[PDB]
Design a protein around this ligand. Structure first.
Ligand SMILES: *[C@@H]1O[C@H](CO)[C@@H](O[C@@H]2O[C@H](CO)[C@@H](O[C@@H]3O[C@H](CO)[C@@H](O)[C@H](O)[C@@H]3O)[C@H](O)[C@H]2NC(C)=O)[C@H](O)[C@H]1NC(C)=O
Ligand SMILES: *[C@@H]1O[C@H](CO)[C@@H](O)[C@H](O)[C@H]1NC(C)=O
Ligand SMILES: *[C@@H]1O[C@H](CO)[C@@H](O)[C@H](O)[C@H]1NC(C)=O
Ligand SMILES: [Ca+2]
Ligand SMILES: [Ca+2]
Lengths: 177, 527, 560, 177
């Protein structure tokens, strides 16, 4: 694991907001997180574009299965580890990569899922503004542990561990060690 | 002994003492080879990495320029910069040596990894050179490294047959290869590879925007400045390259059925014969230039910017308020005006060039200042404003609207101060590409041959102010930081905030809103 | 004891004291008969002169008003003054006394106690000056100001406008006129059966009487000034075009009312003449038979009918008849086919308040969708349907979208209101001031920016249509009235004095600046389109709404 | 025996100038004049509208015959005493009327000449600026005698002799009496 934050009773939220004059756009995305949970349904990580742009990335457990929904402008694209159960309490790591409209997802040592949606579609994830970890004010708050969060070179959980100026921690969330 | 060891070998340069006491030294590196000679089977092919030389390359004079035809009355006067049109004889000096092997750049290093400012020239995609632009003054003034680049022009760099036979956009690809060489090698000169800024005027301003829209350019430059230049202007992209390729082919005995043998034909023939060739498009459009290839340029620059199909780049756009002087000048009498009947005609075929009866009438109305209805001096200013708005102001504000809405720190400007010259008419406003001598800091070193106007203390103190905004932007992505100077507010479609640049520099609201939106919101869907 | 002997017999006025520190008394001759009753055989006929009386008739009370139907809804608020609509219950009381025999005047004569000559004659009667003299104590014939009330040619009554203050402020004689309205005064079968323009012909008969009789009251029949607002502003203009107006007046003022708006002339008189006949069982084949029976029917039955025209047009009103109105007012004015009069024309900031005061919300804005519909409603009702629907709607919408502030619905409210203002009022008014200037008539132009907002007027609103009337009439001078119940301030009193100075100076000299001095209101000409911006901070400015006035005058007519 | 003024050697001009703000327009025009001359070519009275406007009235003598030319909007309208010379040195009174497009013309007490122009004709003489008696500047100066000029109510020559503020006499004009 990396920097571990426990998400407790009633859930919490860790929000990194990109400085206004440096809100980044991109064509390919890297997203990796280690976790351990029992939730059948929860939202772990959500990346949002600025207000007005409907562009998003969401890492979410649904039906007990980990996966990612996302839209860059055209269509809502879904990808998940369908074959196995991921809310077993054991520490898992899920890696997500997003090359344009196309994406791949892997969990632990298991076979790598590839998703390639048909029809021409946009590639740019426009002006990204906020990363939300725990998604308390989303519907399903995460309960369990999130550790070592990578989003395109950003160690977001390590940033909150050394009092980064942009991150806010509201809700039941504790640092490990 | 100005000597730098790079990836591709060791290179020697020259030390220019500036034509000013205040300003200090600049080490020049002229005719540096950034890509392999695009000749033989490499003509009409993407640029190749250049080959490593073993010794020390005597890169102290300019390199030959790319093959270009330069004749007074055979070039689109209205399209090219004004100092260019009016000074063709002096221009021709820098265009004397012409090699097909022409992919070379020039580096100006002042004497920390200094910011990198790549300058892309361009009148009509047919002619021009970075050698015209002396990135000396701008360099030691703002302590920035400046680069002026040569790329395949005319046919030799933009020929497309609409398929894989000729893909086009080679020029653009050369610019890419330039930035490739730069981000890899500029470190050896003392540059910051993560602070590279491409800037240009005219078509060279379009090229800037055209690179922002190409996935190839990713991770090669962070900021961008476009001056009197857009990817959205009618002459920014060639929409019928195969049409002209085949019309060119007929003029050199190459027009064959199969497209692949037509391309192999033209390759074999000498470069001088294709360049001297007489090929011209319906006015305000182009024969050779960037094409929609579905690879470099994935789709139309208009679609891609409404889709947000571009990375977040630090953009600074702008126009001068008398852009299309060249359109109007040729019908001005001694009393410095334009008659009512000359106004009605100009509009008419302006519609017959770019677009019927209602459009002919609306424009005619919109560009009549009913405060001074009958004065032909006023009727000149607004007829001037017509082309100014339609070709420059409208596309520029369109871009800035679509860039700020997709979260990019955009900054817009109006340049209203012209260099006082007797080369142009007295009544004149700042013409197309009149901001160049200010950007390049020419007022600092007095008049040159290429900019001969009587330079005044105000022109120098304006040029200092502009060079500040320009360098500051290349440093921080913000024209206000870090060098101290009215602060240039960030542009956004809510209040469309632009810096009105001139004798009285001021931040103003919604530049020409009521006329700009005529072209962007009323005219589009009138049919 | 105010007896005056006109050409038709003696009349007895009533002295009226005024309730203001400054202003002096006014002898008012009310219900003075300028024409013989247009009753029976004389219904739908031009007015005849009155019958001479050998007694002393009491011109001391208001005479009946012309037949009209006053009903909320069934009258077009978008057209009538905003003081007129918001206060109908007050207007009912002025109109509840009714008759077809209604052709009357009210004459407001200022009276000083200064005895100039009568006291010299009291000492010395022998000298020619008194022995057989003509000069009076109030010597010097006073300029005459005839006001033509104008609603929608359907209603109204001069009795609504008390000329007292305006009379005794500018030392002018103010006259208010009753003329035939509704069907009675404007029915036309489009020929010689009914020729229309009867009301107009009344006004002309009024001006005949006045030009023949005002001298007795001490009036100058060569310094007569017809002025009007609303549709009465239109009558003023329609009279400058009428040949019948030769020698009867010399200077004219039109307030937010031209002869050029879509509701100043009835262009289908016969369509509406025959629809009315249908509603009273008189729609017969020959027109003269149709008019024949309409004369036998009691006026009330005719005035009580629901004859709605299309929006912003009229059903009954002045018609192009090639007699009273020689041709189409646009043709008559493009070719300069009009006698010379000193003109003073003008419009208000927000005439078309009542064109928006329905869709404006609690935060007082207008939605992007509410706006697009309103222009569509505007276009289809005023400029018809096919030919060029889209190219016209999209242009107007573009020209009435403030682009410096495109999304804010408050300023979208303003411009929508401007659309109706510019189109119905500013465009035609600036057109008329243009065409009068060219053919050498001294022209003067004003914008009206200062209102007095009541408790019925929405706060955001500027000067509404008609809002200028109280100031012209000097209502702030005597405090709030039941008709104009605004709490007029010190600032409102100052302005109302200033408007009155011009408005009388104009009747006195034909130049608003002289004699009584107050920024000189410069003359208007097509060259610099110079206008006085009347308000709290008055300026003479140039080219009023130039880019919008010309949109309608120049570009739009090309868009069909 | 009107207010006689003698026009002499070379010629002269007596000019009426209606105050700017009281320039008359009109539908009908009455104009009478008394004269003795021997001239073949002359302009006696010319009425001109404010600059820009075309509207003009000219009482003239061409090849001995007397006439009146006028434009009030559409066309120039002629009416001429066609069949008798008037430049016989004897005394003559010419009376000219106008109503809309039409005109009337009588010389002394001959049959009255009547002109009725074909086609649609305008009626208003606009903003009349100046009455020019003597024609010196039109191009043909008058030599002879002119008496009691009546025009739309105005006795021009009388008020000219009566030292009018708006009359300017310049040239070889002299007052008989
Ligand atoms: C029409 O406008 C006038 C001018 O503002 C109004 O008169 C003002 O009336 C208010 C009360 O409604 C007075 O305010 C009072 O001031 C006294 C001190 O003098 C203070 O002790 C009270 O607390 C109160 O606020 C104000 O003096 C008065 N101004 C004057 C002198 O005219 C008037 O109310 C309006 N007319 C109506 C009745 O609608
Ligand atoms: C060239 O030849 C091709 C193939 O024969 C033909 O389709 C085309 O019309 C020609 N193009 C031009 C414009 O010369
Ligand atoms: C009245 O009668 C005439 C003649 O029959 C007819 O043309 C007209 O439409 C009728 N009017 C109405 C509105 O009923
Ligand atoms: Ca996107
Ligand atoms: Ca005329």
């Amino acid at each position: 694991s990396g920097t571990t934050y426990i998400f407790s009773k009633g859930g919490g939220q860790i929000t990194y907001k990109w400085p206004p004059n440096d809100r980044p756009s991109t064509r390919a995305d890297r997203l990796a997180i280690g976790f351990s949970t029992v939730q059948k349904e929860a939202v772990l990580v959500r990346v949002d574009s600025s207000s007005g742009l409907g562009d998003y990335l969401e890492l979410h457990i649904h039906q007990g299965k980990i996966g990612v929904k996302f839209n860059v402008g055209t269509d809502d694209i879904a990808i998940e580890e369908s074959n196995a159960i991921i809310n077993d309490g054991k520490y898992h790591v899920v890696r997500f990569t997003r090359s344009g409209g196309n994406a791949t997802l892997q969990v632990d040592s298991w076979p790598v899922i590839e998703r390639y949606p048909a029809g021409r579609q946009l590639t740019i994830f426009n002006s990204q503004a906020t990363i939300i970890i725990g998604g308390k004010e989303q519907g399903q708050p995460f309960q369990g542990q999130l550790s070592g969060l990578y989003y395109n070179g950003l160690k977001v959980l390590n940033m909150a561990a050394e009092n980064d100026a942009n991150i806010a921690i509201v809700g039941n969330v504790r640092l490990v060690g | 002994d100005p000597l730098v060891t790079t990836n591709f070998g060791k290179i020697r340069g020259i030390k220019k003492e500036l034509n000013n006491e205040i300003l200090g030294p600049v080490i020049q590196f002229l005719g540096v080879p950034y890509a392999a000679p695009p000749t033989g089977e490499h003509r009409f092919q993407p640029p190749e990495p250049p080959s490593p030389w073993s010794d020390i390359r005597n890169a102290t004079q300019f390199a030959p320029v790319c093959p270009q035809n330069i004749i007074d009355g055979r070039l689109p006067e209205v399209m090219l910069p004004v100092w260019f049109t009016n000074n063709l004889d002096v221009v021709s000096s820098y265009v004397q040596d012409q090699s097909e092997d022409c992919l070379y750049l020039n580096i100006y290093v002042p004497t920390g990894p200094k910011p990198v400012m790549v300058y892309i020239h361009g009148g009509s995609y047919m002619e021009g050179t970075g050698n015209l632009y002396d990135g000396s003054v701008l360099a030691s003034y703002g302590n920035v490294i400046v680069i002026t680049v040569n790329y395949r022009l005319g046919v030799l760099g933009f020929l497309s047959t609409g398929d894989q036979a000729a893909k086009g956009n080679y020029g653009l690809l050369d610019l890419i290869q330039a930035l490739r060489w730069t981000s890899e090698n500029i470190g050896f000169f003392g540059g910051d590879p993560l602070r590279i800024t491409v800037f240009g005027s005219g078509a060279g301003g379009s090229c800037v925007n055209l690179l922002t829209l190409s996935h190839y350019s990713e991770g090669l430059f962070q900021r961008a400045i476009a001056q009197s230049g857009t990817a959205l202007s009618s002459w920014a992209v060639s929409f019928q390259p195969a049409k002209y390729a085949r019309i060119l082919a007929t003029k050199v005995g190459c027009n064959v059925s199969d497209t692949v043998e037509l391309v192999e034909c033209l390759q074999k023939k000498p470069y001088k014969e294709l360049v001297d060739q007489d090929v011209q498009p319906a006015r305000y459009h182009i024969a050779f230039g960037p094409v929609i290839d579905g690879d470099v340029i994935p789709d139309d620059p208009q679609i891609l910017m409404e889709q947000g199909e571009f990375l977040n780049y630090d953009i600074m756009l702008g126009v001068n308020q008398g852009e299309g002087l060249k359109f109007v000048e040729n019908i001005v009498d001694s009393d410095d005006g334009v008659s009512a009947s000359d106004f009605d005609f100009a509009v008419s075929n302006f519609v017959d060039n770019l677009y019927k009866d209602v459009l002919r009438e609306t424009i005619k109305f919109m560009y009549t200042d009913w405060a001074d209805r009958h004065n032909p001096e006023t009727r000149r200013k607004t007829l001037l404003a017509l082309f100014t708005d339609h070709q420059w102001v409208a596309p520029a504000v369109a871009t800035a609207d679509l860039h700020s809405n997709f979260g990019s720190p955009t900054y817009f400007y109006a340049f209203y101060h012209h260099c006082q010259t007797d080369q142009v008419p007295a009544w004149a406003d700042a013409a197309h590409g009149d901001e160049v001598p200010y950007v390049l800091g020419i007022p600092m070193i007095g008049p040159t041959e290429l900019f001969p106007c009587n330079f005044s203390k105000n022109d120098v103190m304006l040029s200092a102010v502009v060079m500040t905004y320009w360098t500051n932007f290349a440093k921080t992505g913000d024209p206000n930081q870090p060098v101290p100077q009215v602060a240039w507010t960030r542009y956004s479609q809510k209040d469309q905030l632009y810096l009105h640049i001139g004798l009285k520099p001021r931040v103003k609201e919604h530049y020409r809103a009521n006329k700009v939106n005529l072209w962007l919101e009323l005219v589009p869907h009138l049919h």
